[PDB]
Design a protein around this ligand. Structure first.
Ligand SMILES: O=P(O)(O)OCCNS(=O)(=O)c1ccc(OC(F)(F)F)cc1
Ligand SMILES: *Cc1c(COP(=O)(O)O)cnc(C)c1O
Ligand SMILES: [Cl-]
Ligand SMILES: [Cl-]
Ligand SMILES: [Cl-]
Ligand SMILES: [Cl-]
Ligand SMILES: [Cl-]
Ligand SMILES: [Cl-]
Ligand SMILES: [Cl-]
Ligand SMILES: [Cl-]
Ligand SMILES: [Cs+]
Ligand SMILES: [Cs+]
Ligand SMILES: [Cs+]
Ligand SMILES: [Cs+]
Ligand SMILES: [Cs+]
Ligand SMILES: [Cs+]
Lengths: 267, 395
């Protein structure tokens, strides 16, 4: 499929940025996670980034460390996540769905087979957080064989060689890292228009800015700097954490937040 | 692009977030440069000799082998400053941090020996040291935590995941992912992303180099085999390295068998785990069927790293080195045996290596064999553990 290509073309026609929330699949349980994800979509999410709970999420700050832990407390497994993904796709035909994986979960039962399962359930991209471009070959090859976009990370300090590598190898979108460190709403990061311009020159996949995005102004700023949109994770997951005791209020606050963030992306 | 091969066959690599690749490249370049720098080598040798106390003794253990055709020597890393071999490589890495212009150190620790070793090196060399330690390990390793604090280190409990060593490993990398411009990550074993398996081997290889010179002096030949316990692989690769090209010398690594391999409660990933990708490397590891990282169980807390260095997995694959396991009960008997018959209290880690050597002797007592066991540390730290076991079984 061409779900990201279609999305960005449609957004471009509206001079509009993409807003893309992250959540952990199965946080705080399968049923509530499914309702969370439908809420994010109804409230205006343009695409999703979805985490499979992993024992060792070493690119994630405490907020998302805790999301993984809550899903584990609910007994969530990768197999159940793939069941979730199939159902999400059966409800929602065009929204791009990207996974946030760690390498062991992809390599575990064979890299090719992992990407084949992604294709079967209707996933559009995979970002493997602990696989740098230097190690990417078997992952990106398997992704492309299975019509999955391999998502590459562009650090805010990327030199020309790295930009050319990310531009050539990536598809779907290019992940423009706001800053060094790990995920978290506490630390606000990026001064990225230089990278944005070079990625465009090299015909990279459109850039989405991520890490530390927690406010509408940051979404607006990302689009103004020339990015195609913005990803927000910790800010969304914090609403889950804060509202565990009231699933109704959780959904209401998620809706409000996503609505505001998406509004910031509009022309 | 790297200066050195990041792989040992299929094993190893640099499986870190993209943000950390410049830190690994910087470290590799600094290492390659330092290895060619006689001033660096002189400074390292000076610390090893005058601060840590190298060379360490090679002791012939006659009582233990009486009436057999085994001759057994122990390489006495138990006598190194700090009481374990870990001191060698933390001094080298502290010097690399300084070479790069860094004044801060990050370290992970499980049982606490690496934290203590990192803290002592940092105190000596004027580096500000912070140590991550799973909260469950903090609670159970009060002596080591206090030692680290006495030495001026900051000890930070890690509450995420399983609250143990692997979780501390993660936290160290999370910190470094933001702080690498001013901080060096002082990894504690011959594992993790390149260039750490290479650096740690090279900064531990004096164990085997000394052993070779000492055995030639005393015996006029090479050993039939050198035997070392394998947690993450640093002491074993430090013993093995200088003998790799000596094809007649057996290289035997001993993983913890815990309550028994068949129970699943062990720490022997190289022979009984499954290759995965974690902690920056492709290597055998303890993991669930669906790919979650598991814990290594041993009576010896120091053998709980849930994977193994990639060079060991490679040496096994080509049949250069052989890997075996020793259970908690076998390790305990070896510990008691060495105390009673040689007056040396061995670390329970090291007791796994000794136990395998004792098995080699006892199984075939008329086989002529010249063995060296790497006595990786002293066992003062283990006396409460041992006391508690002997009392519970009614000895
Ligand atoms: O809003 P924040 O600060 O929580 O950031 C959320 C990001 N979630 S994600 O899936 O895009 C994401 C993207 C990349 C990550 O690591 C990597 F860069 F090393 F690959 C980790 C998570
Ligand atoms: C740390 C430790 C070990 C295990 O770590 P390796 O990296 O495998 O050497 C073994 N023995 C002692 C005494 C230790 O302190
Ligand atoms: Cl697409
Ligand atoms: Cl849709
Ligand atoms: Cl899978
Ligand atoms: Cl090379
Ligand atoms: Cl390779
Ligand atoms: Cl002589
Ligand atoms: Cl031999
Ligand atoms: Cl006592
Ligand atoms: Cs595999
Ligand atoms: Cs591209
Ligand atoms: Cs706007
Ligand atoms: Cs000495
Ligand atoms: Cs003898
Ligand atoms: Cs091991």
């Amino acid at each position: 499929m061409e779900r990201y290509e279609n999305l960005f073309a449609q957004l471009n026609d509206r001079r509009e940025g993409a807003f893309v929330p992250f959540v952990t699949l199965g946080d705080p349980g399968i049923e509530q996670s499914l309702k969370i994800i439908d809420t994010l979509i109804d409230a205006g999410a343009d695409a999703l980034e979805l985490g499979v709970p992993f024992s060792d999420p070493l690119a994630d700050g405490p907020t998302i460390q805790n999301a993984n832990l809550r899903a584990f407390a609910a007994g969530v497994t990768p197999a159940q996540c793939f069941e979730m993904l199939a159902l999400i796709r059966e409800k929602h035909p065009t929204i791009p769905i990207g996974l946030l994986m760690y390498a062991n979960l992809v390599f575990n039962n064979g890299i090719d087979a992992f990407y084949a399962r992604c294709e079967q359930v209707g996933v559009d991209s995979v970002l493997v957080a602990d696989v740098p471009v230097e190690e990417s070959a078997p992952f990106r090859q398997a992704a492309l064989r299975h019509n999955i976009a391999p998502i590459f990370i562009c650090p805010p300090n990327a030199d020309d060689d790295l930009l050319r590598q990310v531009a050539s190898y990536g598809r779907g979108y290019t992940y423009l890292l706001s800053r060094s460190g790990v995920t978290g709403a506490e630390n606000r990061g990026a001064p990225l228009h230089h990278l944005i311009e070079k990625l465009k020159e090299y015909h990279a996949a459109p850039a989405l800015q991520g890490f530390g995005i927690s406010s509408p102004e940051q979404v607006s700023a990302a689009v103004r700097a020339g990015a195609a949109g913005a990803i927000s994770g910790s800010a969304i997951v914090k609403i889950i954490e804060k509202n565990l005791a009231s699933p109704k209020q959780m959904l209401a606050e998620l809706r409000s937040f996503v609505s505001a963030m998406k509004a910031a992306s509009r022309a | 692009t790297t200066l050195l091969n990041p792989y040992f066959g299929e094993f190893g690599g640099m499986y870190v977030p993209q943000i950390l690749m410049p830190a690994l490249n910087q470290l590799e370049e600094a290492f390659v440069s330092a290895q060619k720098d006689p001033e660096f080598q002189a400074q390292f040798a000076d610390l090893l000799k005058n601060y840590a106390g190298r060379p360490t003794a090679l002791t012939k253990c006659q009582n233990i082998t009486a009436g057999t055709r085994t001759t057994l020597y122990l390489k006495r890393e138990d006598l190194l400053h700090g009481g374990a071999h870990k001191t060698n490589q933390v001094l080298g890495q502290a010097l690399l941090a300084k070479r790069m212009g860094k004044s801060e150190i990050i370290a992970e620790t499980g049982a606490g020996q690496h934290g203590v070793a990192s803290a002592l090196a940092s105190a000596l060399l004027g580096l500000k040291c912070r140590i991550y330690m799973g909260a469950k390990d903090v609670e159970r390793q009060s002596p080591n935590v206090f030692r680290m604090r006495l030495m001026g280190a900051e000890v930070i409990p890690v509450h995420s995941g399983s609250a143990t060593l692997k979780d501390a490993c993660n936290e160290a990398l999370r910190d470094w992912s933001g702080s690498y411009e001013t901080a060096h990550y002082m990894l504690g074993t011959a594992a993790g992303p390149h260039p750490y398996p290479t650096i740690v081997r090279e900064f531990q290889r004096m164990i085997g180099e000394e052993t070779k010179a000492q055995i030639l002096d005393k015996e006029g030949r090479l050993p039939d085999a050198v035997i070392a316990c394998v947690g993450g692989g640093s002491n074993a690769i430090g013993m093995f390295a200088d003998f790799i090209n000596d094809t007649s010398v057996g290289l035997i690594g001993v993983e913890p068998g815990g309550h028994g391999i068949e129970t699943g409660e062990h720490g022997a990933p190289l022979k009984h785990g499954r290759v995965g990708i974690y902690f920056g490397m492709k290597a055998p590891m303890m993991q669930t069927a669906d790919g979650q990282i598991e814990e290594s169980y041993s009576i010896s807390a120091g053998l709980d790293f849930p994977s193994v260095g990639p060079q060991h997995a490679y040496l096994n694959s080509i049949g250069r080195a052989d890997y075996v396991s020793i259970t908690d009960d076998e390790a305990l008997e070896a510990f008691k045996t060495l105390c009673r018959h040689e007056g040396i209290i061995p670390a329970l880690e090291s007791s796994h290596a000794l136990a395998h050597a004792l098995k080699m002797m006892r199984e075939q007592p008329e086989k002529e064999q010249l063995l060296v066991v790497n006595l990786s540390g002293r066992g003062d730290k283990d006396i409460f553990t041992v006391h508690d076991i002997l009392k519970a079984r009614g000895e």
